[PDB]
Design a protein around this ligand. Sequence first.
Ligand SMILES: Cc1cc2nc3c(=O)[nH]c(=O)nc-3n(C[C@H](O)[C@H](O)[C@H](O)COP(=O)(O)OP(=O)(O)OC[C@H]3O[C@@H](n4cnc5c(N)ncnc54)[C@H](O)[C@@H]3O)c2cc1C
Ligand SMILES: Cc1cc2nc3c(=O)[nH]c(=O)nc-3n(C[C@H](O)[C@H](O)[C@H](O)COP(=O)(O)OP(=O)(O)OC[C@H]3O[C@@H](n4cnc5c(N)ncnc54)[C@H](O)[C@@H]3O)c2cc1C
Ligand SMILES: COC1=CC(=O)c2c(c(COc3ccccc3)c(C)n2C)C1=O
Ligand SMILES: COC1=CC(=O)c2c(c(COc3ccccc3)c(C)n2C)C1=O
Lengths: 273, 273
Amino acid sequence: VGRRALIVLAHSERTSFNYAMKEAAAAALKKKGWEVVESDLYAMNFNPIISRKDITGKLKDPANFQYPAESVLAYKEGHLSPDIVAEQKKLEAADLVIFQFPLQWFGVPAILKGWFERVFIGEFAYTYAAMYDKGPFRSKKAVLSITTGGSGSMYSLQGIHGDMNVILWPIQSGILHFCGFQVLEPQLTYSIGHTPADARIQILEGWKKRLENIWDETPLYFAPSSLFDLNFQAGFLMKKEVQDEEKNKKFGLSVGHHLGKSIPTDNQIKARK
Amino acid sequence: VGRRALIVLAHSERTSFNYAMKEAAAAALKKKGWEVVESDLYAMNFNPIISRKDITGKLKDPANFQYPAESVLAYKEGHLSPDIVAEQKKLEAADLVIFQFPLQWFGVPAILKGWFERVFIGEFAYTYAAMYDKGPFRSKKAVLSITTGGSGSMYSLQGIHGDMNVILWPIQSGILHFCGFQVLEPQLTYSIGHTPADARIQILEGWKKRLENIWDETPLYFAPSSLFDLNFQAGFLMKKEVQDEEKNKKFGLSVGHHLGKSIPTDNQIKARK
Ligand SMILES: Cc1cc2nc3c(=O)[nH]c(=O)nc-3n(C[C@H](O)[C@H](O)[C@H](O)COP(=O)(O)OP(=O)(O)OC[C@H]3O[C@@H](n4cnc5c(N)ncnc54)[C@H](O)[C@@H]3O)c2cc1C
Ligand SMILES: Cc1cc2nc3c(=O)[nH]c(=O)nc-3n(C[C@H](O)[C@H](O)[C@H](O)COP(=O)(O)OP(=O)(O)OC[C@H]3O[C@@H](n4cnc5c(N)ncnc54)[C@H](O)[C@@H]3O)c2cc1C
Ligand SMILES: COC1=CC(=O)c2c(c(COc3ccccc3)c(C)n2C)C1=O
Ligand SMILES: COC1=CC(=O)c2c(c(COc3ccccc3)c(C)n2C)C1=O
């Protein structure tokens, strides 16, 4: 189990439900003896733009600045920006990380996107070797508590916006699982601007009760890295014997690995291997 | 046709392939008689953080700030921070809108994300009564030119990263098309960091060559909004008659609208549906 959890909030108003949602988690987690710490991005006057201003030390090659290589170099020799180091110290310590935020243009707010780009540095957050399954944060679990303006129906299989499982994919698979995270089931709060005060106070309570047993929760299913040949040579594709063994299955392995077939229902919203 | 083009470049270095890729476009397009305007976010020192300071005038509800409402109102009444407006003036003028950027964390850089979040303001860029094909920019066409670190195999149907079409959905459909744009095929240039010098040159010439007949191109396929019940009591779901008519069809309509069925190949990468 865990004892320390980091809550990254990305909203500008202390009067919003998101803020409320954050304070709910803080109170709850603390109750069950957790140890909370938070990253209210807007509160930290956080900078989301990656740039050489991220490396305090001497760049290895100013003529042609290659951010990935320079920042990864920075992480080793110790030349990273002071705000990035501190955030990297929150993560490293944290067992559970809750990303509290409002859906903005089918994705995460710009400020949180930059928080990833600047904190999730190579070596630290991921290794081209130990990707996904073997990533650095593998002993950690992460969750997305989102809020939307559009209602749930809009995001169903017949909804005009499309399948929400498709929207959460790049985030939960591409950013979170890539670094080794076990991603729990997303806490989805649809049309929070069309919710009666009464129903809203229940969401705060619905969210807190969940947090009492959040760690023993069954995580989301991701195709294990063992089903692929992990080398530039092999282009990182599914082992041949798997490509064949999978050909007899009705559904794909997940939203990203649908393999031209039917996508397993709520692969990004519901746990069940 | 289209004599006006806008190029959005989200890259800090003018020594990158993205900067070059942008110069390529500008060169090609001008030679064929197009008026080319640009938005070098990193050059412009663009502000990507959505805040109440995005509204010049006085708010309607200062103690309970809702970005959506206050920003729409400010749009309509004429008081959006002047920088956001300059950008909107650029968009209204453009027939073609090109987005040049490296793929970052399975998505769009935080700088471009925040660009969308601040310039694509209600009423101006999108209307809940004129979604997707009935959007404000329906007479415009958008294109994504994306450089990638990982090879295209990593993004095929059997690559560890999962299909590129699922990664593209949120953007092309969720942002671009939701506003009415006709989204043209993305110019995908994979593992740019592992590509021969000579090759890199052909990539720049293929871009240019393709831009000579970009307007005449048939756009990517998105389910028309005539298939949906654009009304609240119906939840914005697909019409019954249409729903039935589909239950006997092998393939789904698109990525997000896979309908539990099989998604046509390269729904987001190729056009012909
Ligand atoms: C740039 C941008 C892009 C967007 N893109 C999308 C999109 O793609 N898809 C989509 O669906 N939505 C989108 N939205 C809408 C956004 O997701 C919602 O406006 C947001 O999630 C609403 O929640 P909130 O907490 O931010 O704030 P609020 O709108 O304030 O709503 C919270 C509500 O709860 C009330 N409340 C506050 N505190 C408490 C408390 N302690 N207890 C009980 N009630 C409380 C408030 O009074 C209010 O009515 C976008 C918004 C912006 C600005
Ligand atoms: C925070 C972050 C997150 C990332 N996330 C991802 C991800 O999720 N998925 C992924 O696949 N990749 C990812 N990347 C990698 C990124 O996609 C690549 O680093 C980028 O696309 C490389 O292209 P570039 O144009 O930016 O610059 P450069 O690395 O400079 O490369 C351009 C190359 O072409 C050469 N060149 C430059 N100009 C010219 C010219 N005019 N003619 C010919 N050759 C030229 C250069 O010398 C160089 O070798 C990420 C990078 C960062 C920093
Ligand atoms: C403040 O709320 C919203 C603000 C938005 O900026 C927004 C919403 C949605 C989604 O949904 C709807 C759709 C129809 C009617 C009402 C809400 C999108 C895509 N955007 C960009 C909101 O709800
Ligand atoms: C500078 O390049 C890269 C820098 C990244 O920051 C990055 C990449 C990738 C994706 O890709 C690969 C490519 C080859 C082997 C293993 C992983 C991801 C997710 N991130 C966050 C890169 O390629």
